[PDB]
């Protein structure tokens, strides 16, 4: 399983979108849920973030979906 942001083996790229959502706020929440977080990048309509293929994330109030595609990034991905 490989990352769409970095090409890394061992990742699934999710997109994240929510009200009053930013990237640091995204990451804090994810860690707040016990998830291990890889590369992140903000995109034109939201955020991309790598989660473990095994991870089954459930943040209250946020919508988290695996990406089919990566489009309209706003920044280069990094950790
Ligand atoms: Cl499942």
Numbering used by the authors: 425 to 503
The authors write:
The ‘heat-resistant RNA-dependent ATPase’ Hera is a DEAD box protein from Thermus thermophilus.
To visualize the structure of the C-terminal tail of the Hera_RBD, we crystallized several constructs and mutants of Hera_RBD. Two of the mutants, Hera_RBD_K463A and R444A/R449A, yielded structures with their entire C-terminal sequences visible in the electron density maps up to aa 510. Although the point mutations are likely responsible for the different crystal forms, they do not per se impose this particular conformation of the C-terminus, and only the far ends of the C-termini extending away from the RBD are dictated by crystal contacts. For the Hera_K463A/32mer and Hera_1-491/32mer complexes, the Kd values were 1.0 ± 0.17 µM and 1.1 ± 0.13 µM. Mutants were grouped into three classes according to their Kd values: (i) with no or only a moderate (<5-fold) effect on RNA binding (K439A, R487A and R492A), (ii) with an intermediate (5- to 10-fold) effect on RNA binding (R444A and Y472A) and (iii) mutants that showed a >25-fold increase in the Kd values (R449A, R444/449 A, K463A and ΔC-tail).
